[PDB]
Amino acid sequence: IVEGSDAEIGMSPWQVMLFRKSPQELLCGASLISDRWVLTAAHCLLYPPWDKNFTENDLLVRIGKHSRTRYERNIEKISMLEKIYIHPRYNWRENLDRDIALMKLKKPVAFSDYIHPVCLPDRETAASLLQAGYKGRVTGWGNLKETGQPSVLQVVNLPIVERPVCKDSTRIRITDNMFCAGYKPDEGKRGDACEGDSGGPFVMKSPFNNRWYQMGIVSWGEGCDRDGKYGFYTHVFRLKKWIQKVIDQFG
Amino acid sequence: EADCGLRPLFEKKSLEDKTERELLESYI
Amino acid sequence: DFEEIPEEYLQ
Ligand SMILES: *[C@@H]1O[C@H](CO)[C@@H](O)[C@H](O)[C@H]1NC(C)=O
Ligand SMILES: N=C(N)c1ccc(Cl)cc1
Ligand code: NA
Numbered sequence: 676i677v678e679g680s681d682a683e684i685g686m687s688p689w690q691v692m693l694f695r696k697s698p699q700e701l702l703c704g705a706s707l708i709s710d711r712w713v714l715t716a717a718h719c720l721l722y723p724p725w726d727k728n729f730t731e732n733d734l735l736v737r738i739g740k741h742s743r744t745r746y747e748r749n750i751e752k753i754s755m756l757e758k759i760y761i762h763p764r765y766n767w768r769e770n771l772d773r774d775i776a777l778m779k780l781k782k783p784v785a786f787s788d789y790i791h792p793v794c795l796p797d798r799e800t801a802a803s804l805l806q807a808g809y810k811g812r813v814t815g816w817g818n819l820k821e822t823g824q825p826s827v828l829q830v831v832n833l834p835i836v837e838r839p840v841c842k843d844s845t846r847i848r849i850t851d852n853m854f855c856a857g858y859k860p861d862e863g864k865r866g867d868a869c870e871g872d873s874g875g876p877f878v879m880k881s882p883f884n885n886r887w888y889q890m891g892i893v894s895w896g897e898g899c900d901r902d903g904k905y906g907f908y909t910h911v912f913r914l915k916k917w918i919q920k921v922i923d924q925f926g
Numbered sequence: 927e928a929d930c931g932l933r934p935l936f937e938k939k940s941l942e943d944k945t946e947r948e949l950l951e952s953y954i
Numbered sequence: 955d956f957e958e959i960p961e962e963y964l965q
């Protein structure tokens with residue numbers, strides 16, 4: 676995260692770190708949506724242009740974390756993966772359309788002060804909140820600048836951007852399964868996700884019921900925190916029927 | 927979950943985090 | 955760069 680700040684303890688208790696077993700390293704962010712399901716970006720797991728195609732046994736998830744690099748004894752919980760599910764129409768060839776994946780854990784994780792699931796939006800919460808100028812929050816352990824790494828989880832609040840401005844900022848084809856967020860050059864304030872934040876959550880706190888909802892997944896950007904560029908996020912609500920179908924049939 | 931999105935150290939104790947108000951103020 | 959995690963999670 677660029678131009679963010681250190682998270683408070685327990686501020687993002689749904690935040691998950693996707694961790695490579697060998698060599699031991701951060702791969703991506705992710706989020707906890709129930710005691711046995713973790714949501715992330717498909718490109719964290721499958722990206723053939725970079726020879727990336729992880730299997731379950733390659734990976735672990737670390738839940739309840741704050742420090743990036745420490746083993747947070749008595750706080751974090753480390754879970755193995757039973758199964759990866761990637762959206763069947765994830766478009767890694769062109770523009771990362773439908774950049775969404777689920778991971779089922781081998782055993783349920785116990786909730787705690789530090790470990791708690793985020794809500795997924797209903798149609799009405801999505802319609803109400805996914806409006807240009809409304810701010811969400813992005814969290815992760817990724818790089819602090821495009822060209823460096825945080826001690827602890829970073830947080831930044833960013834406004835959703837009008838769809839024409841998103842489209843006019845890039846040559847990539849934008850789809851209805853994406854939204855973009857960030858400040859405009861004339862707005863002064865700054866901030867973005869960056870390398871290593873992919874797969875983590877874009878959340879909004881509903882003013883109707885005071886619950887946090889995951890509206891987006893950190894998906895892609897061209898650089899980090901560049902003027903006139905914006906971060907792109909997977910539109911979780913638009914893909915929720917697939918999420919539900921996976922959970923209903925494999926959970 | 928019935929309990930989703932309510933943080934133990936924040937909403938469940940009626941404590942506010944340092945920047946959540948910035949989000950609320952944008953919801954106009 | 956990362957602190958070693960317990961061996962039980964790698965077995
Ligand atoms: C990814 O790997 C699995 C085997 O691990 C394979 O069945 C699948 O087709 C691969 N996907 C691509 C796009 O190469
Ligand atoms: N440069 C990146 N890796 C990047 C990825 C995702 C976002 Cl939303 C912003 C930047
Ligand atoms: Na364009």
Ligand code: NA
Binds near residue numbers: 905
């Ligand atoms: Na920017």
